[PDB]
């Protein structure tokens, strides 16, 4: 830059650019223009009673909203000039915690003084961490309820117990209304962790829900979700997805009066027929003498526990040995491995992505260029403005086709969050998620096992295909989910746009969802080919230099003749290929690069393309509170 003053002026300009950018982000939240500041509370340990501190937390002005079981409230004060909306969740109740922390702007964790947190709390903590934390603030309760001699050491013992999850964070105690005021102040002025999924879409938390049935006998009618728009500008033409109940097209939006403004009937838009985004999840349009033979003719309760131990041994057989499958001697090997082929090299040798495809692929949607459409959609949300309802506006939504069970469970306690789907998000595709196994569970999980997915705001059961996470075209199928590897789960699911957090759960017993694998959503495409391998073992029992006789790999003669072009390989590293079949039983002469050890094992690799099972249902049962066995 040069020149003392001119060099400094450069720095002065950049300060004014960055300070304006910061002021833009904070005025959007908690105030006269912005919505409220939605704060979720989780007490982590069982000893902690949330009403004990939540009654300190309430006092400004209160507006106690109520449900069946849960009691969440609005807080408003012109002293700090900040609008709040508190929400309280019990850990273990996985269903509620995750579904309303994915809208909550701030999480406030409550912690017991003598221990760190409960095992039940740790379960919910592992989920929140992996589905995406907003802004966390740690709080305690039993600190001032102890003498000064212990009070110093208690906070030190907590810090060591906390470090293993929250590395460096201050703990603010909740005992006095003065202490709680310090906390509110801290929650207001805080660096916001902008969660990527929430920002590109447009969402609502439900403050009040009304049901107008068209026909009560049909048990389907019009919903009236009233709350604040928080994400982007809500467009009526776009579809709307309610979190636990699926996606449905909505009829009408209206903007009534804001029930709680900071300092104290008309419809916004009606949906046209043509501009409307359409509800279509799948594709619409579908001479010899008497006795002589052939040879001479040429001249002329405890059942599941037993199955678990079977799975444990199958996992050991596929961790010690790659994918060693024994050839059947009863059925012909060319028949049992009909659809299998040999690759010269798994990395290089060509395989057509549009070759032999299932009929289930002719029911989904592909992308011509995924990344280009992803850039085009994300630009048309950020750089473009639509005629819809802006953020901060208290609106009411009217949805055309919605079941009674939605309202029924809302009045019980479970919150409704509804987010506007982006373009091409009602359609189905083949979703790919890179996902590592959580150290919590050590249950053997097979490939086409039915699992519970949480692909960011969506919930479903599915049967995935686990794969190698590679950069190449072909991906090798993994028959079991490994404890340390990162793996790609491939499943038919309705197309969502990355980035999105992805969780995997498994229905245990009594209806307990057990977190097995956490990750994220990768690129969504059906062209990503997953390849199942089968390694057939053989035995070299007669060895000459460079050429050897192998048995027990096959049992017929024309089994060897079928897999002639398949290149053999060897445990001790020799690369060969079969020459002649000899016996009527499965014996073969085989050429190699070098001389084989007698201690050796010959083996060929067979490959087929495998596609996932179509087991998509948006309905997933409510889990019971989680506990440790």
């Amino acid at each position: 830059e040069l020149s003392r003053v001119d060099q400094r002026h450069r720095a002065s300009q950049l300060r004014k650019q960055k300070k304006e950018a910061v002021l833009a982000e904070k005025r959007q939240l908690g105030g006269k223009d912005g919505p409220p500041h939605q704060v979720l509370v989780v007490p982590l340990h069982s000893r902690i009673s949330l009403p004990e501190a939540m009654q300190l937390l309430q006092d400004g002005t209160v507006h106690l909203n109520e449900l069946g079981n849960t009691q969440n409230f609005m807080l408003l004060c012109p002293r700090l000039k900040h609008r709040w909306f508190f929400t309280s969740a019990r850990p273990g109740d996985l269903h509620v915690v995750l579904d309303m922390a994915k809208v909550a702007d701030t999480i406030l964790f409550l912690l017991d003084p003598l221990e760190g947190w409960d095992s039940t709390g740790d379960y919910c903590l592992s989920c929140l961490f992996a589905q995406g934390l907003p802004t966390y603030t740690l709080a305690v309760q039993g600190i001032s309820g102890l003498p000064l001699k212990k009070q110093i050491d208690t906070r030190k013992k907590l810090s060591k117990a906390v470090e293993k999850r929250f590395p460096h964070d201050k703990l603010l105690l909740l005992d006095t209304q003065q202490e709680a005021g310090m906390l509110l102040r801290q929650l207001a002025n805080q660096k916001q962790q902008h969660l990527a999924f929430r920002d590109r879409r447009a969402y609502l938390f439900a403050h009040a829900v009304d049901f107008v049935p068209s026909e009560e006998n049909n048990l389907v009618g019009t919903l009236k979700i009233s709350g604040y728009v928080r994400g982007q500008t809500l467009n009526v033409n776009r579809l709307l997805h309610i979190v636990g109940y699926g996606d449905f097209q909505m009829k009408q939006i209206d903007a009534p009066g804001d029930p709680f403004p900071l300092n104290p009937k008309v419809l916004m838009k009606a949906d046209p027929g043509r501009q409307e985004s359409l509800q279509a999840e799948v594709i619409p349009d579908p001479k010899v003498p008497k006795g002589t033979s052939s040879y001479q003719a040429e001249w002329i309760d405890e059942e599941a526990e037993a199955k678990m131990l079977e799975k444990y041994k199958q996992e050991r057989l596929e961790e010690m040995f790659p994918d060693e499958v024994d050839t059947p001697r009863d059925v012909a090997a060319r028949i049992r491995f009909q659809k299998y082929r040999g690759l010269k090299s798994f990395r290089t040798s060509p395989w057509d992505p549009k070759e032999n495809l299932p009929q289930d692929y002719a029911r989904i949607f592909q992308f011509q260029n995924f990344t280009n459409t992803r850039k085009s959609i994300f630009k048309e949300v950020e750089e473009k403005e639509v005629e819809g309802a802006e953020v901060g506006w208290y609106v009411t939504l009217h949805v055309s086709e919605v079941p009674v069970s939605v309202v029924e469970c809302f009045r019980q306690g479970t919150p409704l969050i509804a987010f506007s789907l982006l373009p091409h998000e009602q359609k189905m595709s083949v979703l790919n998620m890179v996902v590592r196994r959580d150290p919590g569970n050590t249950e053997p999980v097979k490939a086409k096992e039915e699992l519970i997915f949480h692909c960011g705001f969506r919930r479903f059961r599915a049967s995935p295909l686990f794969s190698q996470h590679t950069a190449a075209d072909k991906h090798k199928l993994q028959r079991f989910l490994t404890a340390d590897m990162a793996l790609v789960a491939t499943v038919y699911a309705p197309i969502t746009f990355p980035p999105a957090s992805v969780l995997l759960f498994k229905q245990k017993s009594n209806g307990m969802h057990s977190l097995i694998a956490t990750g994220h959503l990768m690129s969504v495409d059906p062209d990503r080919m997953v390849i199942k391998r089968v390694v057939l073992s053989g035995h070299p029992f007669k060895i000459f230099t460079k050429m050897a006789v192998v048995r027990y790999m096959f049992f017929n003669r024309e089994d060897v003749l079928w897999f002639k072009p398949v290149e053999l390989r060897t445990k001790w590293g020799r690369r060969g290929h079969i020459k002649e079949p000899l016996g009527t039983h499965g014996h073969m002469k085989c050429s190699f690069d070098g001389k084989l050890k007698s201690q050796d094992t010959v083996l060929m690799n067979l490959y087929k393309r495998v596609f996932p099972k179509w087991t998509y249902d948006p309905y997933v049962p409510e889990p019971v509170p989680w506990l440790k066995s």
């Binding site: 040999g342 549009k354 989904i364 897999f563 072009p565």
Partner: peptide
């Protein structure tokens, strides 16, 4: 007859164009 096929390219997913 050995490890050779004619496998037709006749059924594919409907692709969204850019």
């Amino acid at each position: 007859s050995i490890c050779s096929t004619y496998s037709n390219l006749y059924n594919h997913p409907q692709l969204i164009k850019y």
